[PDB]
Amino acid sequence: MIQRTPKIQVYSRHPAENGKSNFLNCYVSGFHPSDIEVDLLKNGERIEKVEHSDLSFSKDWSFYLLYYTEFTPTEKKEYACRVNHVTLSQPKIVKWDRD
């Protein structure tokens, strides 16, 4: 068995086709097992309709999830990614550092 804590990166990307589109991304990488809970948050609020949850694996025991959705960030909110994984005794919340 192997378990690997996800690396969690939260970042925004504008698809080059539409600069006004902005995706909040939670890239959860390298984890195993694949069981995982990933949410994008705005303040504590789960962003419900995350358009993309792209899971892949490299090696059988390394999973990668790009969990991203269009958003329109306000300065008035914090955006984060919350990951639960067995390796994470507490939900890991990684804030988007937009600047």
Residue numbers in the entry: 0 to 98
Extract from the study:
Here, we report the use of the TPBLA to explore the role of the protein sequence in determining the aggregation of the naturally amyloidogenic protein, β2m. β2m is 99 residues in length (10.8 kDa) and has a seven-stranded β-sandwich immunoglobulin fold that is stabilized by a single disulphide bond linking Cys25 and Cys80 (31, 32). The protein forms the noncovalently bound light chain of the major histocompatibility complex class 1 (MHC 1) and is important for antigen presentation. Another example is β2m, in which aggregation of the wild-type (WT) protein is associated with the deposition of amyloid fibrils in the joints of patients undergoing long-term renal dialysis (dialysis-related amyloidosis [DRA]). More recently, two single-point variants of this protein, D76N and V27M, have been identified in amyloid deposits in the viscera or tongue, respectively, with the former occurring in the absence of kidney disease.
